Amino acid sequence: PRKFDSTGMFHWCPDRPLNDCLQDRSQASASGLRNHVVVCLFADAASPLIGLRNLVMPLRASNFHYHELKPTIIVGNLDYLHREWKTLQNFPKLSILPGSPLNRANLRAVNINLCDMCVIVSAKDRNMEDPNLVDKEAILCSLNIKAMTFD
Amino acid sequence: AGANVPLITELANDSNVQFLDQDDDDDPDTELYMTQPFACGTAFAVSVLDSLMSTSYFNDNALTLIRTLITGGATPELEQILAEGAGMRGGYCSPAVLANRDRCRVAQISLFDGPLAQFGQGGHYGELFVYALRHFGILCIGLYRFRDTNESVRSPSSKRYVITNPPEDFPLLPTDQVYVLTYKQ
Ligand SMILES: [Ba+2]
């Protein structure tokens, strides 16, 4: 009863619209995400595509049982995720939380004290600024997450 | 009452302050203060904040005094609350946290009328200060006084300039206003 990709290498689900998995903070907190993978994606509405598929594709290998799948959830810009959903729609257990990942309310919603890993990817256009200021957002997010407190 | 409208223009470039008033007749090379607009509170330049980088170094407690005087208190816990991204939130708060509800605000009082009107009748500033502090817990910071005595002949305008903590024996015109650090309304 598990739908796999034609090659049999990856888990698969029928194509669904973005809102089929789009969630707000209330819905994200309602879902008891545990041992999942949070992806703090710093992207603009027109920032170049980075292919989040290549991040979720290895996460959905067929050698993992369906219950062994880590529920990946992406916290980032919503238009960029609209652009990425064309490729991201076929992976099960995926979820989307719009808004900036620097917002502490999001990280409270998608339980980040309980997540198995918190990727921090920046899709913004950089290296046109000072090289030391290129990763300002990623370092700020890392420090913000490391400075949080939970119960 | 076109010219009686109280307005505070904020200036990005301080050198433009000369254009705020025409009767000032001040030299263009004058600094930001000593100019009639800034000295009257009508103008305000962002450049002042740059000078706040200096004092906050020389006086450690300058910035925390400024913020308490200015921002309504802005308790650090409040920007911790705003740091959670949920925005400003709260409901019918308990009286325990309402204990700080009655703190010291800054306001203006008029010597034209009220319990302090007698000090405007040729009284001295120190008398008003001591009386207000002893009777109402009111701390008179300074004066807001007409640029020229409002007799419609000396100056028919409602223009006022600020005097920060005038001396003990400063005479008090009846039309002068007083900046106060009033407590409990
Ligand atoms: Ba002028």
Chain-chain contact of A105 with B84 (C-beta, under 8 angstroms): yes
Method: cryo-EM
Q: Distance, in angstroms, between B90 CA and closest chain A CA?
A: 16
Contact B86 A105 (CB under 8 A): yes
Cα dist. B79→A72, B86, B87, B164 in Å? 31, 11, 9, 31
Q: Is B185 exposed, middle or buried (0-12, 13-18, 19+ CB in 10 A)?
A: exposed
Q: Please tell me the distance from the alpha carbon of residue A66 to that of residue B118, in angstroms, as a whole number.
A: 86
Scored b (16 or more CB within 10 A) or e, B3-28 reads eeeeeeeebeebeebbebbeebeeee
Ligand 1 centroid to residue B48 C-alpha, Å: 20
Chain B hits for A104, CB-CB cut-off 8 Å, are: 83-85
C-alpha distances in angstroms, A30 versus A27, B123, B138?
5, 69, 53
Question: How far separated are the first and last CA of chain A, in Å rounded?
Answer: 38
- Whose tokens are 């900036």? That residue is A100
Resolution as reported, in Å = 2.9
List C-alpha distances in Å: A36 to A23, A98, A100: 16, 17, 19
Q: CB distance B84–A106 less than 8 Å?
A: no
Min Cα separation B94/chain A (Å): 24
A105 in contact with chain B, both atoms CB, cutoff 8 A: yes
- Beta strands per DSSP E along chain A: 37-42, 72-76, 95-98, 117-122
- Cβ–Cβ contact A104 with B under 8 A: yes
Q: What is the DSSP letter of A61?
A: B
Phi and psi at A37, nearest 5°, equal -130, 115
**Alpha-carbon distances of A53 from A6, A24, A120, B66, rounded to whole Å:** 17, 22, 15, 51
Q: Which residues pair with B180 in a beta bridge?
A: B107, B140
**Cβ–Cβ contact A29 with B under 8 A:** no
Q: Which of A25, A100, A104 to mutate to test the interface with B (most CBs of B within 10 A)?
A: A104
Measured N-to-C along each axis, helices B47-58 and B62-70 cross at an angle, to the nearest 10 degrees, of 130
Residue of A nearest to B87 (CA): A105
